[PDB]
Design a protein around this ligand. Structure first.
Ligand code: A1ACW
Ligand code: A1ACW
Ligand code: CL
Ligand code: CL
Lengths: 4, 124, 124, 4
């Protein structure tokens, strides 16, 4: 999961 | 927005759609390319091809379960492109590049047409 | 094999499937979550959820155009998860995390359940 | 396009  | 994003989601979705295709699950159209038949999901075809997007947004054609392609289309070229739609991988070879490019132009798959043009230019 | 791969293909496919959903093109099921209705593509739901995969591979349920979820399921939690299925982005907030996690457990979306558990653990 |  990432900060888009 | 303040969303988080799962990097592998789109790839995992496509992998699962290809597993459904393999197992003939919820396939809803047969594409006929002369003597050959290919089963697929209309939504995946529309998402990948400008030609299928135009076909399945048409009020009459959206209801067809069989679509016949132009007799000039090569079944192997179509097969290679159908596999690309469901996997992101294109089996481009010296022996198939002309058929693949011609098929991608007909199907309106601009990114494929682009890489074929580049590989052809490099050989000249 | 000797294939080449287009990096952005899977993301571009998912973006186009979400555009079809937006425009209600070729949606083939309505998911009912108490008073709310959500239209979607069965194949996308199956590709993202272990529960929908089990439902639409069942010989009787595969033919249904309406699926009613358990009354305990929160419509906002479902909406957030449906948007995640079609975009890879999860709108996780302090005010919705418990409903989202409960919905993802019911829908069998293991990666979402994993990030919810981690965000909850960090607040404790 | 890349070599996967
Ligand atoms: O080279 C290409 C690939 C391609 C795919 C599509 N597909 C869709 N386009 C839109 Cl805007 N919304 C939903 C779709 F399924 C249209 C045109 C083109 N041309
Ligand atoms: O957390 C999750 C997400 C999820 C999706 C699926 N989907 C499919 N699985 C297979 Cl093997 N082939 C085709 C599919 F559409 C099954 C289980 C699970 N569990
Ligand atoms: Cl393309
Ligand atoms: Cl998930």
């Amino acid at each position: 999961w990432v900060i888009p | 927005d303040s969303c988080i994003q799962f990097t592998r989601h789109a790839s995992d979705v496509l992998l699962n759609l290809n597993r459904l295709r393999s197992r003939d699950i919820l396939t809803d159209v047969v594409i006929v390319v002369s003597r050959e038949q290919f089963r697929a999901h209309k939504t995946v075809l529309m998402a990948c091809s400008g030609l299928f997007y135009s076909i399945f947004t048409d009020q009459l054609k959206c209801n067809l379960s069989v679509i016949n392609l132009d007799p000039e289309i090569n079944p192997e070229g179509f097969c290679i492109l159908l596999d690309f739609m469901y996997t992101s991988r294109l089996n481009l070879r010296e022996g198939n590049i002309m058929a693949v490019m011609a098929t991608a132009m007909y199907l309106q798959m601009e990114h494929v047409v682009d890489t074929c043009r580049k590989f052809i230019k490099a050989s000249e």
